[PDB]
Design a protein around this ligand. Structure first.
Ligand SMILES: *C(=N)N1Cc2cc(F)ccc2OCCCN(C(=O)COc2ccc(Cl)cc2Cl)[C@@H](Cc2ccccc2)C(=O)N1C
Ligand SMILES: *C(=N)N1Cc2cc(F)ccc2OCCCN(C(=O)COc2ccc(Cl)cc2Cl)[C@@H](Cc2ccccc2)C(=O)N1C
Ligand SMILES: [Cl-]
Ligand SMILES: [Cl-]
Lengths: 300, 302
């Protein structure tokens, strides 16, 4: 029993983290097979950063301008290219610790583990949700760029995020492993801000199921609701609308507990309309939205 | 920037987890050098757990009754002994992935990372505090006994917890890696309950500093207070008392922020009397007490 914001075991990713230095920048790289992936802004000087021409800059670099250090070993760079905002450094040695892996692009609302690293050295692990506004609320210090987010499928690591950017507001943005940003952000130090964030409604529901599974049920009620009535209320609190896809995804929790999705939606509808009254759920005074339906199943 | 409940990277522990079976029980063992540590209650049937005589039961087991599997390779057990409430199984092979480690006993209020496992397979990692009642609020499923808690000090893994028990309350109890329980719990299936918990005051203040470092500062107040003053209020609210030792360990945070510890205690006293008024701190509507001062320094410095 019990319920925790739990990350995936990070050992398979720790074995892939290396230190990448170009010019005056040191940050993290992800060594898989014979390639090291890292943010392409590593090739910029802090003056270049407002309007860098990355193609022109990369052409002007040589392999020997990149220092890749695997703990205590120095990896010879023998090629380099760009895919969108990700720099790919070909090295002369395959990483023997390379796990089975996939590159995946996730959707807002989905969660993943972040291995925060500093100058190639793993520092800590935590669970993140991709917010509806395409940011994450992470924890990073200098040298953390190139840290990655991942999920694990039994044996296979799905890499879904690489850390690039901290906005002046303190929110974090980054790319998938194809170098495409999540959200409308660009890797230039121009004025940028994230859209209005919203609550991940399907995750709140999932967590309410986790609460029932743990015996917490003061918030249940005799009412059921329609998806349109629920969504009219949700929009008034900046909650994402619920779709029938969300309802299906909740299906397993609905069966495991005997509480229909739209019966549980009425519980959330009531909590939003009337509030919590200084009661808590799974130890929280606020509604939690960083557990997907799958996270709750996995843990419960 | 940012602030998260972050665990230590778990890879050094993942390489030590193995599966242990005895009789009708499968759970986890910790494979270090040529010994596998696991809960002694692995030798018990459900009926034994009503009143187990561990010494009699262990006598009657042979090395071949212990099936230890490291991934898909089986390890030969060559001796077994009991150390308090943990079994030590001697195997014929040293673990090649043994990290630099030590065994340590922590104090309530201290935090550690938990690598939750299922029958030898790492499943997830999260950060816990040892509560003042010597329980931990964990997340475990069947086959999770023998999962361990740990901290990492640069290269060195400090093992501090092994999971044994889930209380009717849904909270968790276990031992250090020497086999001694944290708290007044026993590995017998008898009525047990977690005593009164309390809030870890020095940790709450650590988190208020984290919040200041991250821009949240509405709760900073004009006022200021003394230790005895604050400790009076604290106890009325089931907050642990604040010692001059706690003031010292907050010293780095106070020095980095320019807010004296007793100044911040004034803010905490106000929050306790007046609540947050629908405001939040670091996105919490409640006061968080599972970050130690070291945790904040580590994550908000390096
Ligand atoms: C990654 N290693 N880092 C360093 C770092 C770490 C940290 F915890 C906080 C900030 C920080 O970098 C400081 C500035 C560089 N930076 C940014 O993302 C800053 O971005 C912006 C700042 C100001 C304004 Cl007006 C707009 C923006 Cl977008 C990145 C590199 C980068 C810069 C600009 C765009 C994209 C990436 C960075 O080095 N980091 C986060
Ligand atoms: C560890 N592998 N497990 C299994 C397990 C996992 C889980 F997520 C939830 C329960 C559970 O164990 C079921 C019962 C065995 N158990 C207990 O801790 C139960 O403890 C108690 C039950 C009833 C009463 Cl009145 C008091 C207690 Cl404390 C342990 C083994 C154990 C039994 C009894 C005392 C201490 C340890 C167990 O196998 N586990 C948690
Ligand atoms: Cl809260
Ligand atoms: Cl024997």
């Amino acid at each position: 029993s019990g319920f925790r914001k739990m990350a995936f075991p990070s050992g398979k990713v720790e074995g892939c983290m290396v230190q990448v230095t170009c010019g005056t920048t040191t940050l993290n790289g992800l060594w898989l097979d014979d390639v090291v992936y890292c943010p392409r802004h590593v090739i910029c000087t802090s003056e270049d950063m407002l309007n860098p021409n990355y193609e022109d800059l990369l052409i002007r670099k040589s392999n020997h301008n990149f220092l890749v250090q695997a703990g205590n070993v120095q990896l010879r760079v023998i090629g380099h290219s760009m895919q969108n905002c990700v720099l790919k450094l070909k090295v002369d040695t395959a990483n023997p610790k390379t796990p089975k892996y996939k590159f995946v692009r996730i959707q807002p609302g989905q969660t993943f583990s972040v291995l925060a690293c500093y100058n190639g050295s793993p520092s800590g692990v935590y669970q993140c949700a991709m917010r509806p506004n395409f940011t994450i609320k992470g924890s990073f210090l200098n040298g953390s760029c190139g840290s990655v987010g991942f999920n694990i499928d039994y044996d296979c690591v799905s890499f879904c995020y690489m850390h690039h950017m901290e906005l002046p507001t303190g929110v974090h943005a980054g790319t998938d492993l194809e170098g495409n940003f999540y959200g409308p952000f660009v890797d230039r130090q121009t004025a940028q801000a994230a859209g209005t964030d919203t609550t991940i409604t399907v995750n709140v529901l999932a967590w309410l199921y986790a609460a029932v599974i743990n015996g917490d049920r003061w918030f249940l009620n005799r009412f059921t609701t329609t998806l349109n009535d629920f969504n009219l209320v949700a929009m008034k609190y900046n909650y994402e609308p619920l779709t029938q896809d969300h309802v299906d995804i909740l299906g397993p929790l609905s069966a495991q507990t005997g509480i229909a999705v739209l019966d549980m939606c009425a519980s959330l509808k009531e909590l939003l309309q009337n509030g919590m009254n200084g009661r808590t759920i799974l130890g929280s005074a606020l509604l939690e939205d960083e557990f997907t339906p799958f996270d709750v199943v996995r843990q419960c």
